[PDB]
Amino acid sequence: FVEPSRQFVKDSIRLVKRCTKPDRKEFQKIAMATAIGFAIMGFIGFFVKLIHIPINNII
Amino acid sequence: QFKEKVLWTAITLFIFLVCCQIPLFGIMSSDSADPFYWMRVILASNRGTLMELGISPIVTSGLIMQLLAGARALFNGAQKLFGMIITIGQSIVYVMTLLITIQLFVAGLIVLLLDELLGISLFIATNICETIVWKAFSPTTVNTGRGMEFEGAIIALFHLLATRTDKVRALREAFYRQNLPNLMNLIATIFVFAVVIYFQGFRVDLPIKSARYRGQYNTYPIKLFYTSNIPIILQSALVSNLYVISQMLSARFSPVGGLCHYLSPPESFGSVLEDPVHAVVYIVFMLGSCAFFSKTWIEVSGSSAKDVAKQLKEQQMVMRGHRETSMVHELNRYIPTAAAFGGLCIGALSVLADFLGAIGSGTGILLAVTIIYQYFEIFVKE
Ligand SMILES: C/C1=C/C[C@H]([C@@H](C)C/C(C)=C\[C@@H](C)[C@H](O)C[C@@H](C)O)OC(=O)CCC[C@H](OC(=O)/C=C/C(C)=C/C(C)=C/C=C/C(C)=C/[C@H](O)[C@@H](O)C[C@H](C)O)[C@@H](C)C1
C-alpha cells in the first residue's frame, strides 16, 4: 500500500518530463500581462486610500 | 467591445467602493468582526457589513432548489430574491452576536447582468490587489516606538532615508522586522508571482486533426493547473475560514490556542519553533487535503477524462492516433496526474508563500494570480 504512492510519484515525474515549459519569451509575455493586469487593479485601492483619508479626516 | 469591457468593470469598481462602506447601526470594537475577520479574503474586506454574503449564496440557494427539484425565467428571477433574503437573515445574527438590502441586491444584479448580457472572483482579486498596494503605501499611523508616522513600507523608507542616516542599521531593521510590512517581505511577493506565473504556463499539448479537414492542427492544452487555482484554493479557504470561526464561536457558546497545534499557518522567519510537528501536519493538510479536493473536483465538474472526449467528439474533433473512442485512454494517462499533482504542487506553492511569507496568508495571494490569468484569457479572446 506504498506501491500505489510509488506509482503516483513515478507517473508525476513522467508527466513533468512530458509537459512543455515557458522558457524565456512567453514567460516574459505572460509576466508582462499579469504585471499590467496587476497594475490596473492595484492602484484602485491606492485611489481608495486617496479618496478616503479626506473622508476619514472629516468623519 | 473596447468601451464595454472597461465600462462594466467601472460599474463593478464603483459598486465595490460604495460597498466598501461601514454601517451606522452602532459602533463597537472588533467583537462582531472576529468571525468576519477570517472571511476577509472570502468576499470583501471590512470589519462590518460591506459585501457579506452577496453573490455566492444566490448560487448555493440555486443549488438547494435544484436539489429539491431533482431529488427558467421564474427560476432566474427568484434566484436574486432568495439569495438576497438570506444575507439579511444572516446579518440579523451578525448584528446580534437594515441597510444591506438594496446594496447587496444591486451588487448581485450588476454582476448577474454582466454574466448574462455581457465576476465573482474579480471581487477577491481587487481585495488582494488593494492589499499589496496598501502594504506598500502605508504612511498612515500614529507615531509608534520608531518612525515619524510610518509603517516601514516603501514610501515610508523613501521619506525616511533623507531624514535618517546610519544605513548600516537601517538595512538590518528593514530586513528583520516582524510586525509591519517589511522590505525583504515585498521581494517575496514578487518571487511567488514570478514562480507561479512560470508554473502557470506548464501544460501538456495534444494533437487534433478535425474530421474531414486535411491538417488543421487545432491542438488542445491540458494545463498543469488543469483546475485553475480557483476550485482548489477556494476549497482550502472554505474549509479553513469556516472551521476557524466555528472553533471561535463554539468555544465561547459552550479553542483558539488550546487546539492550534494542527490549525495555524506559520508566518515566522524562524520556522523551527516549539512545535515543528505542527509544520509537518500543516504541510500534510495543505498538500493532501487540497489535492484530494482537486481529484474529487474533476469527477464532478464536467471536465473529467470521460467527459472531455464527449466535448471533443461533439465539436467534430478527433485525435490523430488510434480509434474513435480510444481518445479517452489516450489522455487518461495525463488527466488524473494533472489533477492530483496539479493539486499538490499548488499546495506546495501556497506553503512556500507562507514559509517564506510573501504578502499574506498564502491563500488569497496565490489565488489572485488565477483571476489575473482568467481575465487575461478573456482580454486576449475578445
Ligand atoms: C458552492 C459550490 C460551487 C461549485 C461551482 C462554482 C465554483 C461555479 C460558479 C462560480 C458558478 C456556476 C454555478 C455557473 O456555471 C456560472 C455561469 C457563468 O455558468 O458550481 C457548482 O455548484 C457545480 C458543482 C456542485 C458543487 O458540489 C461539490 O463541490 C461537492 C464536493 C464534495 C466534498 C463531494 C463529496 C465527496 C461528498 C461526500 C459523499 C459521500 C461520503 C458518499 C457516500 O460514500 C455514499 O456513496 C454512500 C452512503 C453510505 O449511502 C457545489 C455544491 C459547490
Author numbering:
A (entry chain B): 7 to 65
B (entry chain A): 27 to 97, 109 to 134, 149 to 169, 178 to 313, 337 to 464
Paper lines:
Protein secretion in eukaryotes and prokaryotes involves a universally conserved protein translocation channel formed by the Sec61 complex. The structure of the heterotrimeric Sec complex is conserved throughout evolution and contains the core channel-forming subunit Sec61α/SecY together with the smaller subunits Sec61β/SecG and Sec61γ/SecE (Van den Berg et al., 2004; Voorhees et al., 2014). The translocon forms a gated channel that maintains membrane integrity while selectively opening to allow passage of the unfolded polypeptide chain. In addition, the translocon must open laterally to allow the transmembrane helices of membrane proteins to pass into the membrane environment as they are translated.
To understand the mode of inhibition and provide insight into the molecular mechanism of this dynamic translocon, we determined the structure of mammalian Sec61 inhibited by the Mycobacterium ulcerans exotoxin mycolactone via electron cryo-microscopy. Ribosomes were predominantly translocon bound, and particle subtraction and focused classification on mycolactone-bound translocons yielded a map with an overall resolution of 2.6 Å and local resolutions for Sec61α from 2.4–8.7 Å. A model was built containing all transmembrane helices of Sec61α, the majority of Sec61γ, and a poly-alanine helix for Sec61β. However, in the presence of mycolactone, a major structural change was observed within the more flexible N-terminal half, with an ∼9-Å movement of the cytoplasmic ends of helices H2 and H3 and smaller tilting of helix H4. This movement of H2 and H3 away from H7 and H8 results in opening of the cytoplasmic side of the lateral gate. In the presence of mycolactone, the plug helix is clearly visible in the electron density maps, retaining its α-helical character but showing a displacement of ∼7 Å from its location in the primed state. Comparison of the structure of the mycolactone-bound translocon with those of eukaryotic primed (Voorhees et al., 2014), signal peptide-bound, and Sec62/63-bound states (Itskanov and Park, 2019; Wu et al., 2019) reveals mycolactone to stabilize a conformation of Sec61α most similar to that observed in the presence of a complex of Sec62 and Sec63. Because mycolactone must be present in the translocon to account for stabilization of this conformation, we docked mycolactone into this density. This binding pocket lies between helices H2 and H8 of Sec61α, within a hydrophobic groove created by opening of the lumenal side of the lateral gate. Residues that line this groove and contact mycolactone include hydrophobic side chains that form part of the pore ring (V85 and I179) and hydrophobic patch (L89 and I179) of Sec61α and are thought to play important roles in channel closure and signal peptide binding. The locations occupied by mycolactone and the signal peptide overlap and will be mutually exclusive in occupation.
